[PDB]
């Protein structure tokens, strides 16, 4: 199962030594097995006997086919998507930086759009810790 | 400890530790990608030296027509058990 095709294949092999049973005679026909079958190999004497079964299922699909995807614009460091232009709410909201007390978290500003969708490719979080004397202070370094 | 048993505890100094936070990734859908039907093949085969049979069904979709090919062959030790059936059907759709 991949993005190209679907493949289901099952095989079975049966081997035996059904030799003593190929040597049977039909008294009602007054003729033997292989005589009535008119087959000698594997049938007259009975050699190593085999049975093979094979099942193959293949479906072909296109990796693109019908691809309906949302249009996304990538300029430098932000993805801009032309969402539905419904002029009902405000135009754009700017959330400046905010400092969380009792820690050192630095959240950068954001610009959220109503008509379109703007997302920032990279988000940067500064390092911050606590103030615990004679205790193991867990300092979290910056993450992008 | 010295107050209770005149024996002070050994001093333990447990240093810095570095805890790993794995690089986590969340993948969210963007759009639908529904593949187009091109070909479907189903083959069944049985082999025995008294009976060898093979059926093959092939359903193809080319341009605006679906083709369907059916093969059914069989062989045996009796001179009236070995047959071949073939079927070819083309169905072209033009605006209904």
From Swiss-Prot, chain A:
Subcellular location: Cytoplasm; Secreted; Lipid droplet
Post-translational modification: Palmitoylated; structural requirement for proper assembly of the hydrophobic core of the lipoprotein particle.
Domain of life, per lineage: Eukaryota
Induction: Up-regulated in response to enterovirus 71 (EV71) infection (at protein level).
Function according to Swiss-Prot or TrEMBL: Apolipoprotein B is a major protein constituent of chylomicrons (apo B-48), LDL (apo B-100) and VLDL (apo B-100). Apo B-100 functions as a recognition signal for the cellular binding and internalization of LDL particles by the apoB/E receptor.
Quaternary state and interactors: Interacts with PCSK9. Interacts with MTTP. Interacts with AUP1. Interacts with CIDEB.
Known disease link: Hypobetalipoproteinemia, familial, 1: A disorder of lipid metabolism characterized by less than 5th percentile age- and sex-specific levels of low density lipoproteins, and dietary fat malabsorption. Clinical presentation may vary from no symptoms to severe gastrointestinal and neurological dysfunction similar to abetalipoproteinemia.
Name the record gives this protein: Apolipoprotein B-100
Residues shown, of full length: 3652 to 3795 of 4563
């Amino acid at each position: 199962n991949d993005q190209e095709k679907a493949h289901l294949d099952i095989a079975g092999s049966l081997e035996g030594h059904l030799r003593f049973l190929k040597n049977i005679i039909l008294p009602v026909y007054d003729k033997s097995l292989w005589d009535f079958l008119k087959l000698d190999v594997t049938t007259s004497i009975g050699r190593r006997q085999h049975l093979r079964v094979s099942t193959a299922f293949v479906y072909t699909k296109n990796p693109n086919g019908y691809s309906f995807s949302i249009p996304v614009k990538v300029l430098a460091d932000k993805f801009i998507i032309p969402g539905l232009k419904l002029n009902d709410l405000n135009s754009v909201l700017v959330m400046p930086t905010f400092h969380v007390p009792f820690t050192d978290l630095q959240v950068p500003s954001c610009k959220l759009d109503f008509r379109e969708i703007q997302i920032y490719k990279k988000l940067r979080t500064s390092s911050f810790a606590l103030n615990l004397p004679t205790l193991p202070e867990v300092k979290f370094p910056e993450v992008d | 400890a010295n107050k209770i048993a005149d024996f002070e505890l050994p001093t333990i100094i447990v240093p810095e530790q570095t805890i790993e936070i794995p690089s986590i990734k969340f993948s969210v859908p963007a759009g639908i990608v529904i593949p187009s039907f091109q070909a479907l093949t189903a083959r069944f085969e049985v082999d025995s030296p008294v009976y060898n049979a093979t059926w093959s069904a092939s359903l193809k979709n080319k341009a605006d027509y679906v083709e369907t090919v059916l093969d059914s062959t069989c062989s045996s030790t009796v001179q009236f058990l070995e047959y071949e059936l073939n079927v070819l059907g083309t169905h072209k759709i033009e605006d209904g």
